[PDB]
Amino acid sequence: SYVLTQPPSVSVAPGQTARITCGGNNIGSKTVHWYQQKPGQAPVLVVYDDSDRPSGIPERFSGSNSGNTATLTISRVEAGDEADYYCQVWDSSSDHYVFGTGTKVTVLGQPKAAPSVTLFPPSSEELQANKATLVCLISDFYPGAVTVAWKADSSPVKAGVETTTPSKQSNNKYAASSYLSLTPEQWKSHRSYSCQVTHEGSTVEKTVAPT
Amino acid sequence: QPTESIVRFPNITNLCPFGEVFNATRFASVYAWNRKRISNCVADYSVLYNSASFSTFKCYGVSPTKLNDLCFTNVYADSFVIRGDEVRQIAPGQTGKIADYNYKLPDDFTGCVIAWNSNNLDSKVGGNYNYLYRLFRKSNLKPFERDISTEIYQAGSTPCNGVEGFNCYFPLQSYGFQPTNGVGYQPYRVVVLSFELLHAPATVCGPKKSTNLVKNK
Amino acid sequence: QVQLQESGPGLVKPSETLSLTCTVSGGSISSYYWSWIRQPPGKGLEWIGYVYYSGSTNYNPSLKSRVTISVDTSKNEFSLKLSSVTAADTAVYYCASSQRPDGNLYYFDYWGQGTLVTVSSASTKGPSVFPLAPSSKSTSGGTAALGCLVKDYFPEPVTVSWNSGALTSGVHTFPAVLQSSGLYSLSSVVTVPSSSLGTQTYICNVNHKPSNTKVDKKVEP
Ligand SMILES: *[C@@H]1O[C@H](CO)[C@@H](O)[C@H](O)[C@H]1NC(C)=O
C-alpha cells in the first residue's frame, strides 16, 4: 500500500512561513491535495492540484510538489491557523486514495493565560437520587497543560476524582474538566471542599461548602 | 528539465489540435480504435483537466498538473467508445474482453486515460449498432496492438474455412447503446494520451516563455 | 449549495454489520463520485471507498471484503455497510464528494459533519440531567455562571444547546469524561449577566441520539 509520510508536529512564529512536508516514493508524478482540520470540525480543502487554492482560502496558502517531497507553505502564520493538516493523493497502481499521517502546526509565542475555575456544588435533585457530584470547570488557559487537586478540609482526596485531558477551544486556548463523586452522607460530613488548579507554577483555587 | 536552468523553451506558436480528438463528431469502434499523432505544437493541457466534465482522468507515471511544465518528443491520442463498466479495463495490468481483445496498455505505461459519458450522442432510440467490439480471439493483444481482421473464429474441432457455422463465429459483436440502457452499459468516449520520450529534440511542450541564456550561473 | 449530512447508529456490537446513510441536499447525485471517509479518535483520515451514480464501486483494499457502498438516485442518498466490525472500527465517519473525475484530480471539498460510531460489547444507556444552580448573587462583575450536568451515559455523542438555540453567547460545553464504570459525563455552562437571573428562564436542551433522550431542564437559584 502507498504511504504518505508527514511529521507529527511542527511549530512556527506568528508572521513567518510555515512549511509542512509530505513524503512519498516519486510523489512528483502524482497530484497532491491538502486538507485543514480544526478541532471538533470536519477537514476542509485548502490546496488542490499541487498548488491551487479554492475561492475562500486566502492567498497565503500555497503548495509545492517536487521529487519525493510535497510541501504546504502557509505564509503570515496567524493564531487562527493552528490546526491539523493532511496531504491526500490518488495511487495509480493500487487505484486507491491515501492520506498523510497528519501534522499538528502550533503557533509559537502565544501569550500565557491563567485558568478560570468555576466550582459547582451538587444539585439538590442529585442528592434526592442518593448521589452527589462536585463539578470543577477550567478554561481559557495556555499552555494546555493543567493539574487539578481536591481537598476535604484538612485531608486531600483522590479516590473520587476524574479529570479530562485539555482540549482546544474555539478561541485558540485550552479547557479541562474535573469531577468528584461521593455519597450524600460524605458531602454533608465535611464543612468545606476545594478544587486546586495548578498551571505553569501559579495556582488558582475556588471552594464550596455544604449549606 | 527541458533547459530550465533559466527559462528556455521552443519558439513555436501553433496550438496542438486536441479539439479534433476530444470534440470529434464520430468515434471509432474499440476494435478499430483511431490514433492521432500530436507533434510540432504547444500543448495547453489546462484546457483539458480544468475544462469539460470527465468521468475518469487517471494518469500513470506522470502527474497531470505537471504536463504544462514538461516536454516530449511525441504524444499520441487514441480514441474509442466502450461501456461505462468497461472503462476500468483501460489501465495497465487489467484483464477482460476489452483489455485482451481490443485495447491493451503496457505495464510501463506513461500517460493518461480520459473518459466521459457519451450516452446523449453515441446512442440512438432503436439502438446504435455501429460501435463494435472483438468478442473472440486466439490470443491476447500485445500492448498497443490493433486487430481489425474479421476471420471466422474457430471455437470447435472442425475447421471453419472462413464460413460461419457450428462453432464458427464472426469475431465482432455490436454494442446495443440505447438511451434507456443502464448507466453501466451506456457508451463512454475514452481517449488515451501516451507521452513518448526518445533521444531526439522535443516537439511538444506546455506554454512557457524564454530568456536568452548566460555564460555564468 | 450541496450539503451532506450523515445518519446512522452510534453504537454497534463487536460482530454485527454497520449501516450508515449520507443524505445529500441542495443538489443531485447524478454523474459524481460519492465517497466515505473515517477517522478514529485522535488518529488520521482513512478513505473507505466511493460509489458512482451507475452503482459501480471502488473500495480501500484493506476494507474491500467488509465494505458495501450503495446509492439510491430516487432518494438522493448513498449508504455504507461495514460487516464484521471490530474495536479498531470506532471512528467518525464522514461522507465526501466533489465535481472532479475519478483519479489524480479527485479531491474532497464537499464534506459532511460526521457521525461517531462506537463498537462496544454492550450496555447502551441514556443520560441523567441535573441543574447547576448559579453562584450566590454577588453582581461584582455582573457575570454569573449556570450550567447543566449530564452524567452517566453511553455512548458518545451528546449535543446540548440553551434556550432551544436562542442563547448562544458565552456558552461553553466541555468534553466528556470516560469514567471507570465505562460511562461518559460532561458539563455545559454559559456565563450569564446576573441582572436577568430572576426573570430570564434558562433552559438547557440535551440530546442523546443512541438512546433517544431529549431532555429539557431549567436552572434557577
Ligand atoms: C471542446 O469543446 C468544448 C466546448 O465547446 C471546449 O470547452 C473544449 O475546450 C474543447 N476542446 C477539448 C475538450 O479538447
CATH code: domain of residue A103: 2.60.40.10
Q: Range of C169's domain?
A: 128-219
User: Do C11 and C110 lie in a common domain?
Assistant: yes
CA distance A161 to A193: 13
Residues C192 and C85 in one domain: no
**In sequence order, what are the residues at sequence separation of 6 or more whose Cβ sits closer than 8 angstroms to the Cβ of residue A136?**
A117, A118, A119, A120, A148, A150, A177, A178, A179, A180, A195, A197, A206
The reply to whether B36 and B135 lie within a common domain is no
Euclidean distance between CA atoms A190 and B43, whole angstroms = 83
A202 pairs with which residues across the strands? Answer: A199
Query: For ligand 1, atom 12, which residue shows the shortest CA distance?
Result: B19
C-alpha cell at C144: 454569573
Contact between chains at B63 and A65 (C-beta distance less than 8 A): yes
- A4, A89 contact by CB (below 8 A): yes
Of C187, C217, C127, C143, the closest CA to residue A122 belongs to C187
Q: Which residues pair with C70 in a beta bridge?
A: C79
H/E stretch holding B22 reads helix B19-22
* Same structural domain, A65 and A128: no
Among A75, A107, A139, the domain-final residue is A107
Same domain, B99 and B200: yes
Cell numbers 505564509 correspond to A75
Is the CB of C105 less than 8 angstroms away from the CB of B184? Answer: no
Tell whether B60 is covered by a domain. Answer: yes
Atom of ligand 1 nearest to the CA of B47: 9
The answer as to whether B217 is a domain residue is no
Q: Is B76 helix (H, G, I), strand (E, B) or coil?
A: strand
What's the rounded Cα separation, in Å, for the pair A51 and A31? 10
Question: At residue C108, what are phi and psi to the nearest 5 degrees?
Answer: -125, 100
Determine the Cα angle at A110 with ends A108 and C174, to 5°. Answer: 110
Long-range contacts for A165-168 (Cβ within 8 Å, ≥24 apart)? Answer: A166/A141, A167/A39, A167/C174, A167/C175, A168/A39, A168/A82, A168/A144
Specify the number of domains making up chain C.
Answer: 2
Q: What is the dihedral of CA B204, B205, B208, B210, to 10 degrees?
A: -70
Cell 453515441 locates to B122
State how far the Cα of C165 lies from the Cα of C173, in Å rounded to an integer. Answer: 14
Paired with B115 in beta bridges are B56, B190
CA distance B116 to B87: 10
Are B77 and B184 members of one domain?
Answer: yes
Q: Please give the grid coordinates belonging to residue C57.
A: 464501486
Closest CB to B55 among C55, C102, C104: C102
Q: Residue B57's closest CA among C162, C88, C183, C98?
A: C98
Q: Calculate the CA A79 to chain-centre distance.
A: 13
Tell me, yes or no, whether A14 and A99 share the same domain. yes
| Boundary (domain end) residue, out of C119, C141, C165 | C119
Is the same domain home to B116 and B183? yes
Domain range for B155 is: 127-178
Question: Are B95 and B12 in the same domain?
Answer: yes
Q: Are residue C136 and residue C53 in the same domain, yes or no?
A: no
Candidate of B22, B121, B190 to mutate for ligand 1, largest count of ligand atoms within 8 Å of Cβ:
B22
Same domain, A102 and A14: yes
Q: What nine digits make up the cell of C153? A: 451515559
Scanning the structure block, which residue is given the C-alpha cell 524564454? B210
The whole-angstrom separation of Cα C158 and Cα C187 is 10
What is the C-alpha separation between A201 and A112, in angstroms, rounded? 12
Q: Is B176 in contact with B185 (CB distance < 8 Å)? A: yes
Q: Do C187 and A94 touch (CB under 8 A)?
A: no
Which one-letter amino acid corresponds to residue C132?
Answer: L
CA pair distance B42, B40, nearest whole angstrom = 7
Kindly list the distances between the CA atom of residue C34 and the CA atoms of A136, C17, C77, in Å, as whole numbers in the listed order.
44, 21, 9
Alpha-carbon gap, residue A179 to A166, rounded angstroms: 14
User: Do A29 and A2 form a contact (C-beta atoms < 8 A)?
Assistant: no
| Same-domain pairing of C77 and C105 | yes
Total domain count, chain B = 2
Q: What angle do CA C68, C70, C71 make, to 5 degrees?
A: 165
Regarding whether C149 and C115 lie in a shared domain, the answer is no
Do B120 and B139 share a domain, yes or no?
Answer: no
Q: Which residue's C-alpha comes closest to atom 1 of ligand 1?
A: B23
The reply to whether A83 and A120 lie within a common domain is no
A141 located within any domain: yes
Q: Cα separation of A29 and A136, whole Å?
A: 54
- Total domain count, chain A: 2
Instruction: Say whether both B90 and B35 belong to one domain.
Output: yes
- How far is Cα A93 from Cα B107, in angstroms, rounded to an integer? 10
Residue type, position A40, single letter: G
- Which strand (E) or helix (H) includes residue A204? strand A202-208
The verdict on residue B23 lying in a domain is yes
Declared resolution, Å: 2.8
Q: Which residues of C25-60 are buried (b: 16+ CB within 10 A; e: fewer)?
A: eeeebeebbbbbbbbeeeeebbbbbbbbbbebebbb
Q: Which of C28, C33, C102 to mutate to test the interface with B (most CBs of B within 10 A)?
A: C102
Contact in structure between B132 and B176 (CB atoms under 8 Å): no
Cα Rg, chain A, nearest whole Å: 24
**Same domain assignment for residues A93 and A69:** yes
Cβ atoms C26, C1 nearer than 8 A: yes
Indicate whether B184 belongs to any domain: yes
Between the CA of B115 and the centroid of ligand 1 the distance, in Å, is 14
CATH number of the domain to which C88 belongs: 2.60.40.10
Structural domain for A184, as ranges: 116-208
All 3 cell numbers of residue A122?
Answer: 451538587
Of the three residues A55, A75, A107, the one that is the final residue of a domain is A107
Q: Are residues A100 and A122 in the same domain?
A: no
From B170, B154, B52, select the one nearest C100 (Cα to Cα).
Answer: B52
Report yes or no on A2 lying in a domain. no
Residues B115 and B168 in one domain: no
Set of cell numbers at residue B79:
480514441
Nearest to B215 by CA among B4, B1, B6: B6
What are the backbone dihedrals phi and psi of residue B20, each rounded to the nearest 5 degrees, phi first?
-65, -20
Which CB contacts under 8 angstroms, 24+ apart, belong to A141-144?
A: A141/A113, A141/A114, A141/A115, A141/A116, A141/A166, A141/A173, A141/A174, A141/A175, A141/A199, A142/A110, A142/A111, A142/A112, A142/A113, A142/A173, A142/A174, A143/A112, A143/A174, A143/A200, A144/A168, A144/A173, A144/A174
From CA C82, how far away is CA C44, in angstroms rounded?
19
Rounded distance between C-alpha atoms, residue A14 and residue A110, angstroms: 8
Beta-carbon contacts of residue B119 (< 8 Å; ≥ 6 apart): B177, B179, B181, B183, B186, B187
Residues B86 and B10 in one domain: yes
The 3 state secondary structure assigned to chain C is CCEEEEECCCEECCCCCEEEEEEEECCCCCCCEEEEEEECCCCCCEEEEEEECCCCEEECHHHCCCEEEEEEHHHCEEEEEECCCCHHHCEEEEEEECCCCECCCCCCCEECCCEEEEECCCCCECCEEEEECCCCCCCCCCEEEEEEEEEEEECCCCEEEEHHHCECCCEEECCCEECCCCCEEEEEEEEEEHHHCCCCCEEEEEEECCCCEEEEEEECC
